[PDB]
Nucleic acid binder design. Structure first.
Ligand SMILES: Nc1ncnc2c1ncn2[C@@H]1O[C@@H]2COP(=O)(O)O[C@H]2[C@H]1O
Ligand SMILES: Nc1ncnc2c1ncn2[C@@H]1O[C@@H]2COP(=O)(O)O[C@H]2[C@H]1O
Lengths: 200, 200
DNA sequence: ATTTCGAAAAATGTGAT
DNA sequence: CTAGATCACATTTTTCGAAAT
DNA sequence: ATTTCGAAAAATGTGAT
DNA sequence: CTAGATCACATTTTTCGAAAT
């Protein structure tokens, strides 16, 4: 569309290879990102290094907006590329110039925040009310909805490690493993290595 | 300030008593609120009633905005009022227009969304990385930031039932007290009935 | 591109406490 | 009372860098 | 109307499980 | 294991509406 086009025009495009880091938690925030292609992972670490995945973002999604609204803000999390990415970049200052000449570009970003908030609040509840099995069940169902999910004859097929699932639901990798085995005993999913098919 | 004044102008200001709910999770959202005076608690419930305080929102905060950007959306959580509230209302439709002739108001809202994202995100970290003690600890510091909080000569002072805290960190009324005492013991806080002083 | 190949790096199951 | 977290490695699985089609 | 007062509800302190 | 949730009570704080002011 005419807007998310005149926008990329004022953006410096960059390419990150898979697994590379795009945003270091704690660093000064002054740049704003928009994913033209590929997908990233937004995660936070603890003093020990343990990682918790807050979300996956993809083509169309903005990154690093949380710093644009006030001076003195440091990145709130790490953002590591899930796949090779093509990322549009622009400075906050160079961006507020744009809001003042078509705030629609702002509504689009804002909508995306509104969503992230809802979604992240959702996770808070999951963590607070559901046991691990529920959270894992829930995550598999979500993961199956992500765009990087392939379609399988018996449902939707996905690739993820127990380690990673454990970093989404916040439980150990061992536990994920046992739970995965029980969901299969109940013919809910067929687990084979990193390939997990979620039955329709 | 100037703008926020202009905004209120088009808002059908109202009055809400304490314990009264402003938003019902699940209903169609078509209204945007603004707390002129008072304070509210945004909260969510489990399948059987349990509550989780996502956040306290005071004066100057907007309410029911996640419904503003997309269509056919439902309120994402319950919003009850702590003290008595003076809440400015306004329809999304009329609001959207207000933005048209001055995107600065939309900026303000978005700024508030951004901080709510960070905070909710940091809440996820806490729930996944910390044990109750750490959670209760962390909440205490935070509660000692809300406007309804007085200033003590040692740190700060607030009023909150052990029940509430149990609902903000996500643990039982018991655990909250047990760990609370341990806190007094290890001389780090000052408690008594429903009053607390955090040492800084 | 993606297919194949042989390391080399990562992810796993274990199961009593 | 009780969901899960732990712990160290031998054993799997997957990823990786180069040669091929 | 505002305040004062003594049941109820709400909130706790516990130790065991 | 081992933080925490539960359970079943006795014992305080607060909450509130009626009654005094
Ligand atoms: N809860 C979340 N959901 C989605 N994206 C997030 C979340 N928390 C942080 N991020 C993204 O990660 C970025 C980290 O740096 P910023 O704070 O600049 O901006 C943040 C967002 O782009
Ligand atoms: N995690 C949160 N942090 C802060 N405010 C929130 C959060 N979740 C919901 N809200 C507010 O609660 C409102 C509930 O209804 P809406 O979804 O219309 O808009 C929501 C926000 O204004």
């Amino acid at each position: 569309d005419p807007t998310l086009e005149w926008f990329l025009s004022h953006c410096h495009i960059h390419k990150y290879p898979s697994k590379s880091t795009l945003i270091h938690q704690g660093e000064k925030a002054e740049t704003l990102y928009y994913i033209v292609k590929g997908s990233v992972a937004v995660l936070i670490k603890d003093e020990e290094g343990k990682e918790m995945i807050l979300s996956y973002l993809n083509q169309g999604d903005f990154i690093g907006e949380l710093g644009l609204f006030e001076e003195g803000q440091e990145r709130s999390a790490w953002v590591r590329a899930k796949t090779a990415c093509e990322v549009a970049e622009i400075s906050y200052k160079k961006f507020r110039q744009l809001i003042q000449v078509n705030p629609d570009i702002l509504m689009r970003l804002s909508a995306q925040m509104a969503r992230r908030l809802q979604v992240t609040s959702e996770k808070v509840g999951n963590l607070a009310f559901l046991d691990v099995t529920g959270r894992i069940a829930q995550t598999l169902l979500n993961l199956a909805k992500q765009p990087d999910a392939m379609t399988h004859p018996d449902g939707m097929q996905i690739k993820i490690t127990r380690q990673e699932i454990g970093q989404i639901v916040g439980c150990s990798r061992e536990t994920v493993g046992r739970i995965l085995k029980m969901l299969e005993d109940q013919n809910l999913i067929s687990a084979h290595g990193k390939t997990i098919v979620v039955y329709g």
